[PDB]
A paper describes a structure:
To clarify which pTyr was the preferred substrate, we therefore performed co-crystallisation experiments using the C215A/D181A/Q262A triple mutant which is catalytically dead. To understand the association of the triple substrate trapping mutant of PTP1B with the JAK activation loops, the co-crystal structures of the PTP1B C215A/D181A/Q262A triple mutant bound to the JAK2 and TYK2 activation loop peptides were solved to 2.01 and 2.79 Å resolution respectively. In both the JAK2 and TYK2 bisphosphorylated activation loop structures (with the catalytically-dead D181A/Q262A/C215A mutant), the second pTyr occupied the catalytic pocket, whereas previous structures with the IRK activation loop showed the opposite. In contrast to IRK, we found that the first phosphotyrosine (phosphotyrosine 1007 of JAK2 and phosphotyrosine 1045 of TYK2) in both of these structures was located in a shallow, basic surface near Arg 47. The guanidinium group of Arg 47 forms a salt bridge with the phosphate while the backbones of both amino-acids form hydrogen bonds with one another. In all models, the sidechain of Asp 48 formed a hydrogen-bond with the backbone amide of the phosphotyrosine in the catalytic site as well and the +1 residue of the peptide. The location of the second pTyr in the active site means that the second aryl binding site is unoccupied. Instead, the first pTyr is located on a shallow basic surface centered upon R47. An R47A mutant of PTP1B lost its preference for the second pTyr.
Residue numbers in the entry:
A (entry chain C): 1161 to 1164
B (entry chain A): 2 to 299
Write the structure that this text describes.
């Protein structure tokens, strides 16, 4: 997963 | 003058440009320990990590890594610890840090589930009869009381070290209506929440650093730290003109990457400081007007  | 700059960016529409300059000039320090393999499952997101030079170290022998960062503002005389949303397996780590760094306040600016996804583990008990026992760090956490307002909730938590039997009181400040990558409903509802933390004494220098976290701990978290610090400089220097928000944000990005996530979060930071500047200068009626306009009573 990635925050942006 | 912030207002002269603020008005100047709103008429030029260059908020996405001013913010993009900040991402350009932001510091870039090595995250060696974060990108280690053994700490992969301790990192909620892959693009968010602490700098080795500012990361919080856990006082255990096994693995000392927790996605947390000590942000120290020497001039402003205040420190904060920003961290990701605790994963289900770093909840004991989260409270181990709180104990070791001698913190009294936690500030939670997200919900455990937002926009249909799970942004944060339920790292604190919801019922006084159901206390949480983390066996990995030998801690016990018990809910004592909670004052529920319309958009925020202040809990009172007792944390016990099962090894030594010392107990501490931890205030939990939960802001429930600040969406990820969004902004508060109004500057009054934000400032009314900030000062509710100030008056509780969690930010006092006799305690440890306060713990401030959202889902990744940079978006909403930095906005909260940026406003408090700027207001803090403005009461010390007594010279509000001298407070450059763009610089103070760049200073914090030395200790944790990605602080402030959107351009409008940066915009709100200006408005928050501009309005809060009224109390610093001496306005005593604005203390309650924020309380009235926030509509906390509900």
């Amino acid at each position: 997963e990635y925050y942006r | 003058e912030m207002e002269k700059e603020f008005e100047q960016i709103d008429k030029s529409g260059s908020w996405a440009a001013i913010y993009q300059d900040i991402r350009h000039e932001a510091s870039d320090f090595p995250c060696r320990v974060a990108k280690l393999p053994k700490n992969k499952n301790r990192n909620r997101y892959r693009d968010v990590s602490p700098f080795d030079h500012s990361r919080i170290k856990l006082h255990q022998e096994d693995n000392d890594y927790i996605n947390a960062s000590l942000i120290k503002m020497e001039e402003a005389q205040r420190s904060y610890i920003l961290t990701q949303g605790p994963l289900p397996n770093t909840c004991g780590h989260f409270w181990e840090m709180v104990w070791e760094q001698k913190s009294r306040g936690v500030v939670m600016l997200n919900r455990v589930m937002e926009k249909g996804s799970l942004k944060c583990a339920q790292y604190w008990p919801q019922k006084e009869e159901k206390e949480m026992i983390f066996e990995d760090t030998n801690l016990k956490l018990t809910l004592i009381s909670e004052d529920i307002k319309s958009y925020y909730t202040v809990r009172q938590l007792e944390l016990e070290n099962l090894t030594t039997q010392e107990t501490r009181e931890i205030l939990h400040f939960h802001y429930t209506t600040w969406p990820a990558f969004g902004v508060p409903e109004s500057p009054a509802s934000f400032l009314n929440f900030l000062f509710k933390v100030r008056e509780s004494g969690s930010l006092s220098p006799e305690h440890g650093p306060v713990v401030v976290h959202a889902s990744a701990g940079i978006g909403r978290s930095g906005t909260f730290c940026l406003a408090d610090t700027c207001l803090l400089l403005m009461d010390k220097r007594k010279d509000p003109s001298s407070v450059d928000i763009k610089k103070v944000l760049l200073e914090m990005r030395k200790f944790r990457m990605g602080l402030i996530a959107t351009a409008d979060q940066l915009r709100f930071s200006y408005l928050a400081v501009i309005e809060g500047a009224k109390f610093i200068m001496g306005d005593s009626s604005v203390q309650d007007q924020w309380k009235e306009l926030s509509h906390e009573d509900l």
